[model samples]
Target chain A: YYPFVRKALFQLDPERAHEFTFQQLRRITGTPFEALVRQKVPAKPVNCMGLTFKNPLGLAAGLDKDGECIDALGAMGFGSIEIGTVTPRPQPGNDKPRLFRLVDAEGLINRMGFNNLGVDNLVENVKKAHYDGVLGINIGKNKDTPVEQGKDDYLICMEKIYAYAGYIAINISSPNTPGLRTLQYGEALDDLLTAIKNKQNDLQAMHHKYVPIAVKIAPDLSEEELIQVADSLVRHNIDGVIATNTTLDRSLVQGMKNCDQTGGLSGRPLQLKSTEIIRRLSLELNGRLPIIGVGGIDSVIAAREKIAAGASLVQIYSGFIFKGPPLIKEIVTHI
Target chain B: YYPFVRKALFQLDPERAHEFTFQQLRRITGTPFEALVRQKVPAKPVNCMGLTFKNPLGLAAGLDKDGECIDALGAMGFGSIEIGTVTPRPQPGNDKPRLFRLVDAEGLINRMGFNNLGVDNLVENVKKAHYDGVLGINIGKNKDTPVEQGKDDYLICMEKIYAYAGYIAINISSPNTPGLRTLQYGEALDDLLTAIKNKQNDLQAMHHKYVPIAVKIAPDLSEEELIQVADSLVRHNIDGVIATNTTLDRSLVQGMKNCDQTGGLSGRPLQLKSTEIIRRLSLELNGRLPIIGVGGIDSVIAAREKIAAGASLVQIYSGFIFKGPPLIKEIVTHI
Candidate 1:
């Protein structure tokens, strides 16, 4: 079903096609299109982030930076929809020509630089969306904000978005932002996590709501960095950790065009890097915190492998882009 | 000089390699490496958007999202450096695998929802970066902001980043964000342009500075839509227009592995589509507005074609990803 639509959409520029498809989605959001999308989506409920997800196969962030399309995307049968790497304020991202396609390798590289509307805007979008599912609001600092002051941005975003999100994803791993990966280090990480943990406690008390906080890490981390990151997560008593964002490796597609593009590389090439991170994080954390594994998950086998590697739940991004909603159902049913 | 370094970096993950390259850049920022890089960069300056470009070849956005690696990239000899589709705030962007490589087509497809530190962070990065080259700050709305309210997001971003940018690029083309392309439409576009023009005037007076606004359009517009968009660009008195972002057409790479992936497709496959748009825009705009051409421009000939098609200046993204810094020199030297 997606293939037919994909072919037509493929005819237009990707951005236009994306918007056009959603326009159609708006038309069919409450109609049979959604019913068809939801038909095969089994009720494979799973629990994570101290909340229940309809399934483990969740739609990862980036695909839905804002929650604008949550209803449409959620209607397609995702168990969860994690939206935003929302900042305290809005931001445009990198200039044009940021996104790329690695067809042969089934990979993607991007230096989009965290382009998103501010938290208030995202919250408004979230409030209006009809998904009613588990929604994770990933937070980060503004690019202009120095890494030394990163905590303030995170805290600001967290405080504002906490009331609206199902969980808060602390995105310190994205390679697009300079010095962002620095947060995955020892003191910087420890300090950030400690601060966030304290803020979560305060917010939880103030709002009478306890939303889990997950630190999303990078796959490019050295084993030592990973160990330190894991230790900090445990020490800070972080509720969760999303093991592995996109990677900085291009060994898998070295000779390919745009393979060496500057940005985090995701998709098939990321499978091993991310799973290894998850596996190591699993060993390091020793189940102290739940890990939502996401990387190059494109099939049921990959999804199962993430679970085996100690992910409480798995999320899809590149795989979803490649295979569409059916992949979600396939993973849900198979897993 | 860049080849050996690029080769070694290619062995690592794209994002990691990028950081590693920048790490080396920082170490040698004031040292001889930059001198070596600067040696190849000729001073063939061009003029656009009431600004002077050191050369006609500009590094497109996405490659440098947060303006973190500006000096390193600038040292490579680009005429200009355009950074950010920054939102008013920050965002983490999509999940892993959102970026892909299409080696066969010399292309890339990415659904990297505008991932970046927010505008503030980008502004700060710009300030710290010592690259005094022409800097174009691209702006966009938060993904969560409804298209109906997209103008507000754009206005917020423009108002915030205006003081820092050499020129502002209004990105209405990214396919990753839902409904972002709708801004290229008739009424939506007119409303957006009118609002932006009014804001630009206010900002110019307030800041005592005049930064040109460029409307970045998609390659997928119908002839009529193109005509309409062109009319709006002229009607609203836009300073410039970036002809085309990443493309969506995959006919060129049919049967390729990740060809069907969702997101804006850029690199080689986008050449013709973007060129056609420029050619048509040349006719419609009729020199009323300057065109900054981009899309699948990896070769000197491709860059030349853009100029011949009526681009006052050209930018590179996937081409740079495929060929690296040398591509800039090659384009600048040849074109």
Candidate 2:
């Protein structure tokens, strides 16, 4: 059904297609029309960070960015929905051609620059949604914000979403943002995590509830860097680790359309690199913290590979874009 | 004209195509029909490493491993002809399907794993050749040679080809060969350069002819790494540096034919990445050592880009494979 639908939508500009899909989602979400997009995924429970996911498949950040489609997406068979690479302030992101399809690789290269409505707007949308599901809000810094002061943005988004979110995701891995990925190493990582831990503790004290904090990383890091990062995650008391964000490397889908596009690559081309990252991260962490894997899971096999590689949970954004409803159902059911 | 030839040749397996072409080359060289495949490239002098090149363009390594086609290739009016990723001993390299093309990107990905006749055979061929060109004998370790003892293989090949080679290329970066690229960093890099410098001194003292020794690195290393690599070469008193070899990344041609192939990608897709590397390497070296840039040079613009980015000379393998003799004519004439 999606292949049929995609044949038509593939004709549209990638970002335009996303907008139209968002419109459709906003229209049908709350009504009996929800059944059109609804998929009642089975309960294949997985525990991580003192929370039980109804299924180990969730929506990775970068999709439904404003949380406008929370209910719309929750209607689909996702066990949890992580939304809003929402910055401290709004951003329109990079100009046109920011999103390009490598239909050949079943991949998307996006330099969207963490484009989303501001944190307040996303919070309002989240508040408006009737979807009572595990919501992980992935927060990022503003473009105007200097890389050094990025912690302020992350802390702001965390404090604001602390009560609403099941977990707070600190996103310092979007390659589209200048100097963002640099935050994932050494003193910057330690400092960022320290700031996050401090804020989470303060938020927990104020809200009288604890919200798990997961640090989302990129696939471009080496295994040597990875071991050090995982140790830092443990040392900082980050509750969970999202194994990878998109990668800037286009090796997997080289010579395809927009293969040279400036941004992180997502979808099937990223699957191997991302999954291998998860495997290494998992092996090193060894249950010190849970790993949530998300990169290039377009098939049931790919999804299962993530689980087998020791991902406590897995998420999909590009996979969902390409495969649509059936993928979520298939992977969730199989899991 | 080569495009027509390539259509028929590309139909064959990559290695088999090279084999067939080599057989044809052997038949035609030194005959009255020598003019049939000859290319008349004009003189475009560029000085580097105390040697005056007829032109700045040369054949990179990995194209003619046994130096079996020296006269045949020299007829193409190359300024220099590099041959052999020859080891201390004959090796079969990896299994079949080791080469594939991303036609979309005009790139070739090859995991040939330095398949070549032993150094003795290559030296014999060099000695036999009527073509008196700038011959660079690129040497590497055997597969059976452990990484730690890899210096021994380089030393052995250098000692053998001391007289025959116009220059000796030390290859420490072939992603297909396990543990080879590890020699590119820190102590391993320092140690290998130390051994090579020692052997070069011994060879120069014995043979009494000073031939340049260049180190070929990969494009995958970071700018930080590149600066250090350049610094090490300058510090070690190495004669010259080849800014990059092939890259393991497929990002530039991702999702195209053989995009997922496990090898270093070469040709058009590699042009920008390789040029950037040359730029970084040159800035670091600051004319301390000349860089023979070779990763992607399929056009005049790309060739110029390499030169502008501080490549004292440029080399080609995939460019020659895809664009053929005409690319050589165009780049050299324009330069």
Candidate 3:
């Protein structure tokens, strides 16, 4: 009933498995079969960025786009489910063959550039979900949007999802979007943060409760750049810093299948590197802002390391794919 | 009899498998087992960089550093064998966990920066090897040498290995050495090319014949930037261009084991991207400079595509690692 399911999924290549598995999960969501997939992970309370997670291990974004699987993923023992690198406009991402699985290395390279049915569609899906777990909506600019004016996309998405989201993750670090990386540095970073924070305050007053905004950065940032990021996060009074998105690093899995596909490298390989970034941010930012560590975390040891690295909360994506719901029970209990 | 050697080798991790194989190959070189490893490849003679190659395929450098594996690799039927990303000084490369094998992807990530004996030791090994194959000596700056002074190191190795090498490859692309990548662009590139060409001219006049020097480039350069690089090589009248060294790309092999390690990726993952670069340079250089394609030449088709993209000659390393001697014959005979 269990181990063979992943094997069956692996039999199908990545995205098909993504769809087929979802087709069944969608059918089962409100049915009695929901309990079959819904795991009861014990409470391991974590306070970070002014919100409380029942458990530390939230599923990172890029898991479910447009919130279609919020109920499905919500059952997987995730303390929080982050969905949608949704854009204001409905946008189709890159060509087919975007998602690839490197099974031996326990890795996934996803080139799906925030493929979502639009922020409005995502909001609708959010409204439909009854699971009511902590939800973080990840937002990015559309493919056609120029970086110069891309700030509007984030603002638009924030305004749309703010009322529903437990916390909003401003995904500044996804490797797929062109020119988006420039937003992580210097004047661009300052301008974007200033805009988001100003809007965050107005929205907080509007909602009568603060829905914290966390800035997510890539794992590949250099030490200097990471320090600059940490300093900026503190300087801007940012609610949280998600230490990583997926990596653009493929150096570790050389001489293997699907090693040359375009996308962000995620899963087991990202564990230590992501922790390293978390550790650096921890040192640089002190306790000014909580760090949400997201990267190759699969085991209890990996989870603990994220905490030791100064992450108040840790998230998983690829690890969730490989380990399934059991990993949640395994990690939360141990950590 | 040949059934499980690759399987047996796969039992060990990458660099040790390298060492373990080399230990035996060195032992068997003068012994009877040489025939077991050697295979005769049909000649498809190629003219590249003003030298006649018996076949189009050469053994890419970072394989037999310091020429120790010459007789062993020489019998594998490569049209030529490139050796010794040697430094003027004997430099110990990065730490032990440098080289990794992605078995599923048929790829390798090597952070073995130019780990080789000093130039003199390489020259000595070159003189001792019984295999009188077309040899290309790959030169790089030592780890200790800053980029500003790296030109001297290249010239130093060029002078030392010139008498023995059929060609000299100036490696500006390896991701391991610090500050080394800067040599691939801008004023730094012009200065280095000016120095190397001046020395090549002097050495050519003195030796009464030319020993061609090819500029080995990284595959990650932008298409726009690569055009300028091709123009630079043509303007300087460089003998050839090795279209790629290893790549800093890990996007293709995400979430896999050993994917986060330092250094450059090689092998099957590189096949298309390498060909893409080779094809671009083919169009831009337009016969002004012969392109020596290297990266993911694991099969005859992979080799043929390198040529189809306009490589006069090609090279293999990760392919050889995965497929062994048969790959050499299989490729050269068909391509």
Candidate 4:
């Protein structure tokens, strides 16, 4: 169904093709068509971050920034759909063609810069959506909002989206947002973690809802930075850690069409970097916090590799984009 | 740059291709490659809803729910990029395969129920981004939140996102959400208008900022409904009106594959219904408030038809997806 439709869609411009696809998804969702594509991916629900995900395959953040297509995407058999790197306000992201397809490398590179409707909008969308599975709302800061004041944005989003999300992922790793990676190490991370943990405790008490919080880090982090990040997650009692968003290093995909493109690289190229990060973090944390692995997971083997390294559950972005719902079923069955 | 790439990408699934495209856009943005594709689409700025648009070709909501890629999309030369049909909470929206493409009909069907990071998140993304163009934030209610209480969601979103947007688009037309279209007429609309205008005035006073509010209506309305909708806008002193969201009728693509699918229909098939609504709206509105025409606008002629009928400005979603940045330049230059 996808191959033929994709061929037609791909004939158009990429972004235009995306809108076309989203529009189509919007139409067939909640109908028999959704059921038609729905494969009963074997349930391998995992308990992590004090929550239960119906399956281990989760849709990473960024694909559905605003959580608009959650149920439809969720129905595709992902255990969870982590929506948004949501900020405090609505923002027009970077210039045209911010996203690119590295099809040859089975990878993707993006610098979307945390474009999203405000946190308030995200919470509303969540409350109304039907996808009751584990929902992770990934939060981030505004680009222009000084990094020194970044905590405010995260805290604001944390408080607002807290009630709705199954868990909150604090994204301090996306390479697209300037200076965002800075929050991953040293004093900044420590301060951010302290604030986040304290806020989480307070919110839990106030709402009587103990929603766990996780930190999504970059695969680009060095061993030292990765170690510090692992330590910070544990020290702060962070509920879980998503080991790696996209990577900045382009060691793989060299000389590819958009290989020189700036921003984070994900998909096949990122499998190793992210797996290595997860493997190392596993050693460093020693299960202090569960790791949600993501990067270039395209097949069951890739998913298993993440688990073997350290991840309790694995996520796929580019792999999901390339492989579709069957991938989730395949991974779940194999895992 | 896109044709060949699009061809290869077409070999993948629609949703996967979309993610791939977004990833690529994120990478190429802010780099020289972006400039290489950049055509100086003539900017024909317009003033309506108390805001000045650099050009009239605005990327409609749903295309950028979370506002992550505003700058890159904006760089494509759209005067504005209306981000989101945001709700108060984050939602996962409909099931998988919700969005579909009717290639033969040159149309799209979508039931992507206002999936977005909540309003609070939208505000933060807005504050941090670089694109300072005229930004319009479209607002909606939760699917579970009964229509009787829809005003609360709208008001909640209005108050939160007001400071960030150049204008606020009240979306009560999307066919995806049950009872959403009911808000466009009769007492429900009247009550909503009263509450919204009152809140707008109070918010203006509270924040010391004045943001124009526009109502986005569906093209599925009957002549009577269109008249009432037009009258309601004037009676409420609504700053503007976006003439037509997608339609429920399938007469245009009666036998096309997936044309039988549910949800709002946009693109070519939508052209007639949306245009007819706009024409009627023009009569009832009688220049009382500005009308921003959308739906099925694929070419300069289509855009001109909307403008000739009554729309002061135009927006594109399906057409944009089908045509790419060059479309924006064409419309801007021609219009």
On the 0 to 100 scale, the lDDT of residue B190 in model 2 is 98
- Could you give candidate 2's per-residue lDDT for residues A1-335 as a string of tens digits? 78878988999999999899889989987789889998878878878899878788999998888899998889897889999899988988888778998775578999999888899999998889877668899999899999999999998888888888998888988998899988998999999999889998888899999899999998999888899899999998899999889988865454456878889899867776787799899999988889999998875546766777889899999888888999988778765
DockQ of each: 0.01, 0.02, 0.02, 0.01
Candidate 3's residue-wise lDDT over B208-247, tens digit each? 7779989999999998789889989999999999989888
How well does each candidate superpose onto the true structure, as a TM-score?
A: 0.50, 0.52, 0.52, 0.50
Candidate 3 vs candidate 4: which has greater lDDT? 3
Docking class of 4: incorrect
Model 3, C-alpha of B230: deviation from truth (Å): 45
Q: Write candidate 1's Cα lDDT for A1-335 as tens digits.
A: 66666567657754565667667666776676676556456687777767999888777888777667788888777888889777777889887678777655567788878888888888988887778668888888899999998999999998888888899999998888889989889788888988999999999899999999988988888888888888888888899989888888776566567876788888876776787788888999887889999998876656766787899999998877667777877677656
Per-residue accuracy of model 4 over A1-335 as CA lDDT, tens digit each = 55566568658765677677777777887788887656777778788878888988888998888878887888888888899989999897888788888765667888889878889988888876898679999999998989877898999999898778899999999887789889987999999999999999999998998999989988878899888888888888998999888888776566567878887888877775787789999999997889999988876646766887889988888876676666778677766
Give me the runs in candidate 2 sitting further than 4 Å from their true place: B1-335
lDDT score, residue A118, model 4? 82
lDDT (Cα, tens digit) per residue for candidate 2, span B189-275: 999999999988999999999999999999999878887898899999999998788887765454356878788888766766787
Q: How many clashes show up per model?
A: 74, 13, 21, 105
Q: Residue-wise lDDT of candidate 4 within B1-335, one digit each (tens)?
A: 44456567557765566777777766765565667456677657798877888888788888878776766787788888899888999998988788887654557788888888888888877876677468899899988899999999999998888778888889998888988888887999999999999999999999999799989888878888888878878888999999888988876466457878888888877775687688888988888899999988876656766886799999999887666667787678766
Model 3 residue B298 CA deviation in Å: 29
True contacts kept of each: 0.00, 0.00, 0.00, 0.00
- Candidate 2 docking DockQ: 0.02
